[PDB]
Design a protein around this ligand. Structure first.
Ligand SMILES: [Mg+2]
Ligand SMILES: [Mg+2]
Ligand SMILES: [Mg+2]
Ligand SMILES: [Mg+2]
Ligand SMILES: [Mg+2]
Ligand SMILES: [Mg+2]
Ligand SMILES: [Mg+2]
Ligand SMILES: [Mg+2]
Ligand SMILES: [Mg+2]
Ligand SMILES: [Mg+2]
Ligand SMILES: [Mg+2]
Ligand SMILES: [Mg+2]
Ligand SMILES: [Mg+2]
Lengths: 74, 129, 82, 106, 158, 205, 123
RNA sequence: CCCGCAGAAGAAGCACCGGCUAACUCCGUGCCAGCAGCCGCGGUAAUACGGAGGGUGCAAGCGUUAAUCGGAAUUACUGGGCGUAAAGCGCACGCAGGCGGUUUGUUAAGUCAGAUGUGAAAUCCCCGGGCUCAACCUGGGAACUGCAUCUGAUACUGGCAAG
């Protein structure tokens, strides 16, 4: 119910990302769990600023249908 | 005897490149200067110079990048025993366009791209890759 | 003499006639001078089945060429319907 | 002159006229100096979740750049055009005269 | 990842006082399919082991190849100890056109469309080395513009 | 001109059951999957290189009951046509009338749907066609013949069609007993277990 | 090598010689069996191979092999011969076609029946 | 071509299964008889012969044989070789022959560009159309890779004239 850790490399900052894009399906698919729920920074280690950008991106993609909301699609 | 000065130029460059020579000396001529002049625009050679008046001498400064020869390969296409002439539509692509073909057109010696843009054929002197 | 007639091409029971200008002495499918059209007797009755370049045909007639009986009907079943 | 990033989606049963649609939008956009400066396309793609029963549909990207007024008309068109199932008139700060991973993959 | 392909196996033998001692060899290539490929060769008494020797040999001695969207960048000519190979980049959809030995290296290397031909001796081990040597000498526009001290757009001409 | 022997033998050989038999009773129960036929079938056969290519070609053909001679002509046409050959060959195989009828839902099996075409029970654009290899063109409308609809086997095949994820490029009509071959199919829709590049090389040898 | 040397003497297309010269590029030829006898095979083998000497219509005299078990062949027998050499019988380049002309089909043949001219056994 | 009639009724073989090469055992046989495109089998536990079952390929056809090209870069122009594997003449001179350093002018021979005529139709290729489909047939292109003539261009090669 409470863990909170890190992996010691905010990959977005590493690659000098200046704007996470919602069309980078490949990248996104790395931060979405099997169920389809955004993974907390406390796990992957992503820096706070880029996670906000990443999180809106996931939502837009889910909207755009490039990603799946949850997994039980009837 | 010496019967194809152009092939001698190819050997002089190729042997000096394989021997890591800084510079090569040779007898000069308009065609040799023209071919050396063409090489300058693509960066395959550093510089060229001409000394002497009664017996002109063409001097080429070779180029190396990581201690490796810049001229990877060069081979003569048109030879005194066998002339090679290509029409504009059929002009060959040397080193998939990364290299150049020295072409002697009616408007002078130029690269394959210059001949292709101008829609002109000529004699294929050499392949550079 | 030079005549304008139809050369029978196509397959069995589905003829397709080629309208050619040729010397009458030559074989039906043999040597010919010029192509001037075709004629499909099994046309679908909905789309094009016969077209001829009347300009060249008139030129050959003015040169002295004679007109076959069947082709004359074609050069009529057109210039009348339009 | 605000840079928009249209991303509409066309019914999989009407990809025949998709080209013509591009022309329509482009022509009216360009009327007010609507610099297109980008017009990719991902053809048909397997929708992640079955929207409007349609288990698969088209996909188009138009990082256009035109006055605010002209673009607003497009949204009205996309609303009342049955061909376009869904849209997303995002608004980027600058321009993107390049390529996206969706095409660079191939 | 790392994909493994068995290219060919053989039963070599060295005679000894008592009799003929049989041994087995194994040729393999490993690669990530995205511009990196490495060949391996191994000798052992038991075939099982020979594979492990080849796998370890392939893991070490790796090289980088500058791929171009899963296809070659230009026609290349390789030659190793009597085996001459010619490979040519091909349009999308042509698949792999190569002999059995030449085909195996291309999957782990990441090449998807290529026309290849083996001239001279078709000995599998010599053929494999000939292909890799050609790939190593294959240069991309990025290093060619740098090596020639020019820019990419100028030399390319587009 | 048609395979007439047992069907489950082929199914269990080459391994993955692929669209054979009525499709209701579980395929595994009717036979013994993961075991090629024959007395020696119960063993691990170290397949070769030629081996893999052969199996794939054989598998594809049986799924659509296309004889070699016929199949080779499809390959020649696919190579002739512009585009990627492997998908073009798959598109041609899917465009056959007998296959289309099966996916449209009028036949329980591809073999049974093919017999419906052969026995003059299918109408295409108001014209009677009884040739299984007829190529359906985009936007065409395929309609069961009035007399045919009285066949209760067709009705039952419609019912079962629901389980098969309805092909996108086919607009099936239930009570209307019609279909519109919307357009050509695409590689993505077709079973991703088919490696068309293997087929192209094998026939280009 | 040199183009000038090659111009002086162009490349000479070599003519490939047939392995069955007595057929004169014909698939089969009829002949009369001059002699029926037996001969011995080459080195790695041992048997009593059955061969026949035959005079063809074109005058060529050659020896042909009998590929079937048992044969009703003798003097002045008219047979049909086809191509195909015998690996272990030097000088034998032809096979007698079983089941043709005065050569009867092989008795009890059940597999590869078409290769020995034997009618399908009644069920 | 259409429509009705009756009843699964009238319609499946052929080659192969040791390697190459997809697909295996049992019996018989015992260097016998035999097979064999190449490798080769068989001498008493034959996945190779013969029979059986089983299995693989192709199919109203399947096999064998003959023939042409391919693979054969194995006559190599593209696209090979000549120390020892086939292949440097015993050596020199030397004609015809091929080839020819550095230089200006000169022509236009080659060459290169331009144009125009010519390259029958069919075939082949592309886009279509017609036969229920298919072969088949046909419309329009393309192509015909060529040659002649003319007008240029003249670097290079050749040309002569002088260096
Ligand atoms: Mg047939
Ligand atoms: Mg096998
Ligand atoms: Mg050859
Ligand atoms: Mg050699
Ligand atoms: Mg010797
Ligand atoms: Mg010698
Ligand atoms: Mg000597
Ligand atoms: Mg000179
Ligand atoms: Mg001239
Ligand atoms: Mg013609
Ligand atoms: Mg049609
Ligand atoms: Mg025509
Ligand atoms: Mg001169």
């Amino acid at each position: 119910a409470r863990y909170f850790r890190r992996r010691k490399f905010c990959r977005f900052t590493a690659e000098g990302v200046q704007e996470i894009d919602y069309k980078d399906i490949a990248t996104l698919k790395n931060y979405i769990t099997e169920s389809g729920k955004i993974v907390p920074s406390r796990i992957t280690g992503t820096r706070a600023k880029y996670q906000r950008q990443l999180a809106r991106a996931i939502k837009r993609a889910r909207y755009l249908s490039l990603l799946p909301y949850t997994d039980r699609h009837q | 005897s010496m019967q194809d000065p152009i092939a001698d130029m190819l050997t002089r460059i190729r042997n000096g490149q394989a021997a890591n020579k800084a510079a090569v000396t040779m007898p000069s001529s308009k065609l040799k200067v023209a071919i050396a002049n063409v090489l300058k625009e693509e960066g395959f050679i550093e510089d060229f110079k001409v000394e002497g008046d009664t017996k002109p001498e063409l001097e080429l400064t070779l180029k190396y990048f990581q201690g490796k020869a810049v001229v990877e390969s060069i081979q003569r296409v048109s030879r005194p025993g066998l002339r090679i002439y290509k029409r504009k539509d059929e002009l060959p692509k040397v080193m998939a366009g990364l290299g150049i073909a020295v072409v002697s057109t009616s408007k002078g010696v130029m690269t394959d791209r210059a001949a292709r843009q101008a829609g002109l054929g000529g004699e294929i002197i050499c392949y550079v890759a | 003499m030079v005549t304008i007639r139809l050369a029978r091409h196509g397959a069995k029971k589905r003829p397709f006639y080629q309208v050619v200008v040729a010397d009458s002495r030559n074989a039906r499918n043999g040597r010919f001078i010029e192509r001037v059209g075709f004629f499909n007797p099994i046309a679908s009755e909905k789309e094009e089945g016969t077209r001829l370049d009347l300009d060249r045909i008139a030129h050959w007639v003015g040169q002295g060429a004679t007109i076959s009986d069947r082709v004359a009907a074609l050069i009529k079943e057109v210039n009348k319907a339009a | 002159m605000r840079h928009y990033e249209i991303v509409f989606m066309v019914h999989p049963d009407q990809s025949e006229q998709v080209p013509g649609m591009i022309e329509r939008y482009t022509a009216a956009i360009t009327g007010a100096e609507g610099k297109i400066h980008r017009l990719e396309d991902w053809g048909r793609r397997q929708l992640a979740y079955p929207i409007n029963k349609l288990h698969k549909a088209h996909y188009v990207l138009m990082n256009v750049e035109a006055p605010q007024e002209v673009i607003d008309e497009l949204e009205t068109t996309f609303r009342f055009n049955d061909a376009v199932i869904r849209s997303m008139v995002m608004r980027t700060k600058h321009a993107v005269t390049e390529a996206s991973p969706m095409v660079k993959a191939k | 990842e790392l994909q493994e392909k068995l290219i060919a196996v053989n039963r070599v033998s060295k005679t000894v006082k008592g009799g003929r001692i049989f041994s087995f060899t194994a040729l393999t290539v490993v690669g990530d399919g995205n511009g990196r490929v490495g060949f391996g060769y191994g000798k052992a008494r038991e075939v099982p082991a020979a594979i492990q020797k080849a796998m370890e040999k392939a893991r070490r001695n790796m090289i980088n190849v500058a791929l171009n969207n899963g296809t070659l960048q230009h026609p290349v000519k390789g030659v190793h100890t009597g085996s001459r190979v010619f490979m040519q980049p091909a349009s999308e959809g042509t698949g792999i056109i190569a002999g059995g030995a030449m085909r195996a290296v291309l999957e782990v290397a990441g090449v998807h469309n290529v026309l290849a031909k083996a001239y001279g001796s078709t000995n599998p081990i010599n053929v494999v080395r000939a292909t890799i040597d050609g790939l190593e000498n294959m240069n991309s526009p990025e290093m060619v513009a740098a090596k020639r001290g020019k820019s990419v757009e100028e030399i390319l001409g587009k | 001109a048609r395979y007439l022997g047992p069907k489950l033998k082929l199914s269990r050989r080459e391994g993955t059951d692929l669209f054979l038999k009525s499709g209701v009773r579980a395929i595994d129960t009717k036979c013994k999957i993961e075991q090629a036929p024959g007395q020696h079938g119960a063993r691990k056969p170290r397949l070769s290189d030629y081996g893999v290519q052969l199996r794939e070609k054989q598998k594809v053909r049986r799924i659509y009951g296309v004889l070699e001679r016929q199949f080779r002509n499809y390959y020649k046409e696919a190579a002739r046509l512009k585009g990627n050959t492997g998908e073009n060959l798959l598109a041609l195989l899917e465009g056959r009338l007998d296959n289309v009828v099966y996916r449209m839902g009028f036949g329980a099996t591809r073999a049974e749907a093919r017999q419906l075409v052969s026995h003059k029970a299918i109408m295409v654009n108001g014209r009677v066609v009884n040739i299984a290899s007829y190529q359906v063109s985009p936007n065409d409308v395929v309609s069961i013949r009035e007399k045919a609809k009285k066949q209760s086997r067709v009705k039952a095949a419609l019912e079962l069609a629901e389980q098969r994820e309805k092909p996108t490029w086919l607009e099936v009509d239930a009570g209307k007993m019609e279909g519109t071959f919307k357009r050509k199919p695409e590689r993505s829709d077709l079973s991703a277990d088919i490696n068309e590049h293997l087929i192209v090389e094998l026939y280009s040898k | 090598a040199t183009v000038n040397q090659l111009v002086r003497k162009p490349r000479a297309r070599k003519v490939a010689k047939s392995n069955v010269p007595a057929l004169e590029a014909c698939p089969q030829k009829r002949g009369v069996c001059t002699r029926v006898y037996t001969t011995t095979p080459k080195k790695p083998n041992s048997a009593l191979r059955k061969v026949c000497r035959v005079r063809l219509t074109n005058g060529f005299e050659v020896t042909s092999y009998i590929g079937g078990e048992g044969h009703n062949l003798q003097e002045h027998s008219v047979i049909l011969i086809r191509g195909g050499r015998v690996k272990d019988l030097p000088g034998v380049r032809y096979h007698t076609v079983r089941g043709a002309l005065d050569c009867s089909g092989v008795k009890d043949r059940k597999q590869a029946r078409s290769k020995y001219g034997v009618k399908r056994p009644k069920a």
